[PDB]
A paper describes a structure:
One highly versatile encapsulation system has been engineered from the capsid-forming enzyme [name] from the hyperthermophilic bacterium [name]. In nature, these structures encapsulate riboflavin synthase, an enzyme that converts lumazine to riboflavin. Here, we elucidate the structures of the [name] protein containers by native mass spectrometry (MS) and cryo-EM single-particle reconstruction techniques.
To bind unrelated guests, we mutated four residues that project into the lumen of the capsid to negatively charged glutamates. The resulting variant, called [name], encapsulates proteins with complementary positive charges. In the case of [name], contrary to expectations for a conventional T=3 state21, imposing icosahedral symmetry during reconstruction did not result in interpretable density. By assuming tetrahedral symmetry, however, we obtained an initial reconstruction that was consistent with the distinct patterns of the 2D class-averages. The 180 subunits of [name], organized as 36 pentameric building blocks, form a novel 29-nm hollow tetrahedral cage with large, keyhole-shaped pores in the shell. This conformational change, which modifies the wedge-like shape of the pentamer, is likely the result of electrostatic repulsion between the anionic residues that were introduced on the lumenal surface. [name] and [name]-13 possess 12 and 30 such openings, respectively, yet maintain high thermal stability.
Author numbering:
A (entry chain AE), B (entry chain AA), C (entry chain AB), D (entry chain AJ), E (entry chain AI): 1 to 161
The structure:
């Protein structure tokens, strides 16, 4: 049997990070957790690419560009939605998830979903700020594993060629 | 009438297995279910491909890779989804079913949906211990039928060309 | 004005039938209704193509290959969803609906939807009587009509060229 | 560790079927189940042997002779018991279960038990028409595994020699 | 497919009959029933062997003798049990059915169960006068078909040799 999986070492890897500004209190907290887990899991931070955009809606369009760089191996989606805006929450939420998924299948490059949807500010300030459930921590880690995963997929992809 | 279908021999076939890690006490019995059902329906296991991925989300981006190799006849999607988060489960749920469905139409290769959604860890305990219903068994078998069917369709689509 | 349309004669035409097995009692009921209207309204039964798969999920990936041979003109989707499985109902019906739709767009060849979603056994009985409500009867009628329709269009696409 | 188990390929195997005529409305549905599961599992139906006997009582005595042919690998008992007569049900069920047991011990050749004791005709309509719990289907499957098993026990029975 | 089954001609055959005398008013009817169904289904009756024993218990020991003769092809059990007492009925009933069962599996020669257990002499008066249910007739019939079955099976058991 052939087994593919990614270890968690952040060695030799270049990451993308896409960051909103809306609710900057908790998002800024999230990116913190992302950078940290990157560097401590063995990676260098000069390859972190952080792109900022105003709100949740624009997250997709930006990442689509970051991935068509040759030297960003994986990309970290980062944003927050909290049911403050009721007509937009429906359409911004389902569509961003949807657009991110389509981006990855297309480009064949892992994009990970680091978006808190917290139904209130009380559920938001307790996760990102109090509990180690630093959502950016984990989406960051999952992407690391994906990076080494396509390193497994594509390193064998050249040995066969 | 021209009747097609799949008999159930797994002779000479090569399979894809994508595996999540989350709630590994359950996933792993499912994976076992796929591997066993294969080899006990005639197949050999060095041509099974085993990939491990973090959670339900990354299933498509990875499985799409397994279908762009030539030497895979059908890919078996294996993940579990249990109501942990109201924000995460809904969106990622309809998204995996989507991404899987679309890849299958596209790459012209079967992808099966061996994903538990057991409304509790306990309704996953009833599916593996109370009755034969080990979903990895059943969706993997469906996959065998699809591979022999597509072999039926493409062997006759080799005689008329 | 140029009026395009399809008569209801089934001569010169070659058909597709994609047939599940789940809830066979109801599905046999419908496939009989399908081959019935076909050979009655002017066809032979020798160039009907009848493909069988386990459940509703595979309906797409199967029909997708059937309409990709040269000789299959219109395809008659045939399957049953009754609210037994709770995740397979919502997602496996949303994506087969959407899925078969996008196939017919792409291939430019009529695929009809003869999948009942009858919420109980008693709508499964008032359709399963000979009281015409055999959804395969009507759906197979529509694709016959669409069959000679794309004859009218594709043949008129030959006189213009 | 030496693991002995049978895969499910029905390749090259020759089978025994013993089928009563009593209550044949459902028994016939069984034999259908058996022949199918065999051939769909890679077998060819020329090597199926179908024996007919009046009631339940004769099932053992005949089967015993079938397995004393050299060219029969496994034998599928098929019959129906429904509480008709007091002497019939009690004594014939106890002695069939004991009889078929002893025969397999002595002959050193598997005999599986596809006799339903459905305590009503309606518990056999719920064994057959509302589930795919086709008793002969699975009793046949177990027999396939048994044949491959004694294939395993008897192939290693000739390499040690 | 090969179907072995018994036609019903009693030509060329030789039979064993073992008869208790107890409750002779009715046994006599049964014995006559057997002789009839032999002679009228073509049998000649000088090759019928009729043995009489006292009560129910001694049935098996006697049949063992008749089946060890080379020239008897099938043996008919004939005896009557009526709940004259609970001490004898439970154990002697289980033992004859048992002893008979082992006699046939062993000697490989069909033995029929022509024992009425009628819960009163009035279930035996209803068995004999209300409907043709002449149990000796019926089990004698089954013995004919079994004789011709083993004729079929053993005939092919010499053409292969």
């Amino acid at each position: 049997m052939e087994i593919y999986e990614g270890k968690l070492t952040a060695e030799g890897l270049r990451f993308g990070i896409v960051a909103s500004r809306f609710n900057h209190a908790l998002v800024d907290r999230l990116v913190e957790g992302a950078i940290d887990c990157i560097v401590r899991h063995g990676g260098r931070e000069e390859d972190i690419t952080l792109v900022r955009v105003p709100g949740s809606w624009e997250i997709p369009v930006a990442a689509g560009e970051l991935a068509r760089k040759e030297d960003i191996d994986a990309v970290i989606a980062i944003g927050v939605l909290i049911e403050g805006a009721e007509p937009h929450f429906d359409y911004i939420a389902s569509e961003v998830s949807k657009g991110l998924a389509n981006l990855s299948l297309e480009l064949r490059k892992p994009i990970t979903f680091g978006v808190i949807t917290a139904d209130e500010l009380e559920e938001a300030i307790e996760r990102a700020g109090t509990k180690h459930g630093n959502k950016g921590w984990e989406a960051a880690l999952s992407a690391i594993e994906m990076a080494n995963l396509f390193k497994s997929l594509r390193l064998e992809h050249h040995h066969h060629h």
